[PDB]
Amino acid sequence: KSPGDNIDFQTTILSRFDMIFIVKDDHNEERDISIANHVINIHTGNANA
Amino acid sequence: LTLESLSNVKANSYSEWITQPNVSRTIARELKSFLLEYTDETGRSVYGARIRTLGEMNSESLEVNYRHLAESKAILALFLAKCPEEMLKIFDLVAMEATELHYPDYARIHSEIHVRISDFPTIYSLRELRESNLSSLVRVTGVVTRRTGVFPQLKYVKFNCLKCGSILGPFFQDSNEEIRISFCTNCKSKGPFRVNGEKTVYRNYQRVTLQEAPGTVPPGRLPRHREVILLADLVDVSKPGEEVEVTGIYKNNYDGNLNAKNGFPVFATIIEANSIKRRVFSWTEEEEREFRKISRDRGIIDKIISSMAPSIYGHRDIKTAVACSLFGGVPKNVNGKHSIRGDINVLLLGDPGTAKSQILKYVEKTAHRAVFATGQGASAVGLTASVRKDPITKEWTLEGGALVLADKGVCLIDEFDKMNDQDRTSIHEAMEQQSISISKAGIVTTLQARCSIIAAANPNGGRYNSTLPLAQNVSLTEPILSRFDILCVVRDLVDEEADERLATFVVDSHVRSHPENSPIPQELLMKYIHYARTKIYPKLHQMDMDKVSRVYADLRRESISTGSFPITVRHLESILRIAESFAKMRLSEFVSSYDLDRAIKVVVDSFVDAQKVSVRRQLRRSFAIYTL
Ligand SMILES: Nc1ncnc2c1ncn2[C@@H]1O[C@H](COP(=O)(O)OP(=O)(O)OP(O)(O)=S)[C@@H](O)[C@H]1O
Numbered sequence: 001k002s003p004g005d006n007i008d009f010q011t012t013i014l015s016r017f018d019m020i021f022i023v024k025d026d027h028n029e030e031r032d033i034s035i036a037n038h039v040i041n042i043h044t045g046n047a048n049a
Numbered sequence: 050l051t052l053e054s055l056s057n058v059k060a061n062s063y064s065e066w067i068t069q070p071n072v073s074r075t076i077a078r079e080l081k082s083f084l085l086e087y088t089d090e091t092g093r094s095v096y097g098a099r100i101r102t103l104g105e106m107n108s109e110s111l112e113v114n115y116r117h118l119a120e121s122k123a124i125l126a127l128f129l130a131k132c133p134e135e136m137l138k139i140f141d142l143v144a145m146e147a148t149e150l151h152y153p154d155y156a157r158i159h160s161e162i163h164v165r166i167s168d169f170p171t172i173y174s175l176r177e178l179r180e181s182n183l184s185s186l187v188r189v190t191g192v193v194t195r196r197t198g199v200f201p202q203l204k205y206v207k208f209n210c211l212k213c214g215s216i217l218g219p220f221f222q223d224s225n226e227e228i229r230i231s232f233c234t235n236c237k238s239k240g241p242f243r244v245n246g247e248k249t250v251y252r253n254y255q256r257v258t259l260q261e262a263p264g265t266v267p268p269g270r271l272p273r274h275r276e277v278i279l280l281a282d283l284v285d286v287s288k289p290g291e292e293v294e295v296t297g298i299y300k301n302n303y304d305g306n307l308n309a310k311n312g313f314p315v316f317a318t319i320i321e322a323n324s325i326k327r328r329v330f331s332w333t334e335e336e337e338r339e340f341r342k343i344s345r346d347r348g349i350i351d352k353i354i355s356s357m358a359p360s361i362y363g364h365r366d367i368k369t370a371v372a373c374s375l376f377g378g379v380p381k382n383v384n385g386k387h388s389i390r391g392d393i394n395v396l397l398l399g400d401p402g403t404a405k406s407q408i409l410k411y412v413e414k415t416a417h418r419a420v421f422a423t424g425q426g427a428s429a430v431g432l433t434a435s436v437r438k439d440p441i442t443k444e445w446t447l448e449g450g451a452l453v454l455a456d457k458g459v460c461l462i463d464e465f466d467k468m469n470d471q472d473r474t475s476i477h478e479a480m481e482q483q484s485i486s487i488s489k490a491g492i493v494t495t496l497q498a499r500c501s502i503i504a505a506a507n508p509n510g511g512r513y514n515s516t517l518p519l520a521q522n523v524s525l526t527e528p529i530l531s532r533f534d535i536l537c538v539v540r541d542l543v544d545e546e547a548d549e550r551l552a553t554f555v556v557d558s559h560v561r562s563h564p565e566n567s568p569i570p571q572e573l574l575m576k577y578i579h580y581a582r583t584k585i586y587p588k589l590h591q592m593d594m595d596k597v598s599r600v601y602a603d604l605r606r607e608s609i610s611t612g613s614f615p616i617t618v619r620h621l622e623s624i625l626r627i628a629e630s631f632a633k634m635r636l637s638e639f640v641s642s643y644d645l646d647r648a649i650k651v652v653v654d655s656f657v658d659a660q661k662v663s664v665r666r667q668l669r670r671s672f673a674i675y676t677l
């Protein structure tokens with residue numbers, strides 16, 4: 001689908017924003033391992049230190 | 050005089066009889082003797098022990114049993130029953146002297162002792178009060194509906210003269226009528242005297258509306274109500290909505306020019322409460338040791354889950370989700386910037402007749418602070434915060450709603466699918482940032498709404514569809530479905546064996562409920578749950594990391610295989626949050642691998658049950674290791 005087809009609003013609204021980001025679901029093993037490690041770091045308290 | 054001479058009366062009425070000074074001092078002497086010498090033939094004086102206890106705890110209340118006074122001094126019990134005001138004043142002076150003998154400096158500290166008569170024999174309902182009960186002692190049952198704020202009432206009134214400026218000595222204030230002053234003793238004038246509240250001493254005052262309990266009311270009739278006046282030590286003892294027994298003097302209100310609407314000289318009546326008796330998550334030191342003893346057992350989690358909702362049969366997964374929601378996790382603010390929610394949100398999506406309402410009621414009885422709200426009905430606390438003006442008082446109040454009121458607690462929402470837009474925005478904000486922002490009537494503020502949410506909903510059309518997935522089965526949009534940690538889909542598939550035990554359970558409840566006819570007991574479980582929420586705060590260590598990243602990577606790619614809705618980071622955080630509630634049931638400061646595996650099982654089972662029938666059969670074989 002188009003980026004304007006994915007949004008549930010008018011495409012002219014997109015023009016009013018200076019920077020638009022399209023955040024992607026990578027669906028990769030090595031990225032999932034790293035992000036899981038990061039979240040467990042946050043929950044453990046190693047991230048705070 | 051003597052007791053037999055006290056029984057004989059010379060005055061016109063009993064009030065003027067007790068009013069006589071010789072009779073009054075005889076009554077005071079006999080009451081002092083009775084307070085001193087009374088025993089139950091066990092070698093112990095109960096009233097001496099009561100005086101010592103109230104002296105040691107610095108109390109102004111002496112609880113005196115009516116049966117003890119009745120068996121020993123029957124004429125004094127009759128005098129207390131029929132003319133209670135002056136009798137209670139005399140025996141208050143008697144008890145004050147008795148406390149003075151025990152403690153000499155108690156008088157300067159307190160200077161007042163209130164005697165609470167207990168176990169009055171006759172019990173009246175509110176509908177059977179007549180004028181014969183006026184100015185007499187009455188014991189009535191009732192449910193408290195509303196109570197006023199505590200107000201200062203004048204007790205030792207001090208005046209000042211406007212001509213001289215001197216402060217004139219204190220006078221005791223009768224609670225029945227206003228007192229006034231006409232002489233100065235310094236100016237020898239009747240000039241204008243003003244009350245100064247700086248030197249005046251006050252007592253607490255409260256008004257409580259008491260109605261007849263609806264069970265005792267006859268069918269066609271309406272419940273009668275009375276106003277009960279609570280004095281200094283008795284204020285704020287009765288929460289509205291609870292049923293109590295009040296003993297007090299039944300008396301008339303005095304109002305100017307009576308009632309002009311009726312056309313008859315009609316008086317309003319009140320109960321001046323001598324005593325309040327009620328028909329708490331505090332643990333002792335022994336209860337903590339018993340909690341450690343029962344938490345040392347290996348099957349503590351199984352036993353807690355089995356103790357969840359005894360009236361509910363066969364719904365073990367729901368009971369597990371309720372146990373996680375009641376125990377809760379640890380909310381964590383890492384380095385201030387990043388915040389992670391630490392309470393479990395459970396959504397029970399089920400067909401009608403699956404006993405979700407009974408589960409919500411059980412959580413309400415069980416949890417410390419549980420607020421019940423409904424989308425469809427009206428007689429409940431609203432979910433939206435508001436600022437409202439009372440149509441009578443003309444005074445504005447800010448109410449946070451059910452979500453703010455359940456802060457550090459539980460919000461139980463029945464009929465989740467039937468909300469309007471404003472409620473949907475309110476619960477969306479509460480599950481998003483755990484706060485409620487209000488900008489109304491000049492008030493701009495944010496209220497804390499860190500409340501765990503347990504909700505009950507029905508599928509579209511009244512029946513759940515297995516071929517359709519979870520998003521199509523509810524009107525709930527995907528972001529509000531994502532905020533829930535546990536998603537319990539319940540369908541009553543017709544199995545003859547299950548229906549047999551369910552029907553047997555219902556019929557056995559019906560038979561035992563007839564008037565003519567392993568689990569932790571709930572009182573202990575309630576305090577165990579409260580202790581775990583405030584004492585444990587479980588944590589996990591860094592070497593347990595290599596497994597959770599292992600399973601989560603094995604999670605997501607399987608969601609890639611079938612094309613279902615994805616496993617996000619919220620599922621990992623739900624795993625790590627539910628595991629911190631399993632370690633709270635064990636009362637353990639660390640999170641073990643078994644609690645983590647059980648949390649993985651709960652999250653995976655909630656994820657698979659939410660799938661369509663095609664996705665579910667593929668997902669069950671791949672995650673059979675985690676589900677076991
Ligand atoms: N597993 C069960 N164990 C015990 N009682 C049950 C069970 N399932 C249903 N019931 C009974 O069935 C009745 C269902 O009443 P409610 O729980 O009030 O209705 P509901 O389940 O909330 O569904 P609604 O209100 O129609 S959406 C109650 O009398 C329950 O006691």
Ligand SMILES: [Mg+2]
Nearest residue numbers: 405406463505
């Ligand atoms: Mg219901």
Ligand SMILES: [Zn+2]
Nearest residue numbers: 210213233236
């Ligand atoms: Zn004066």
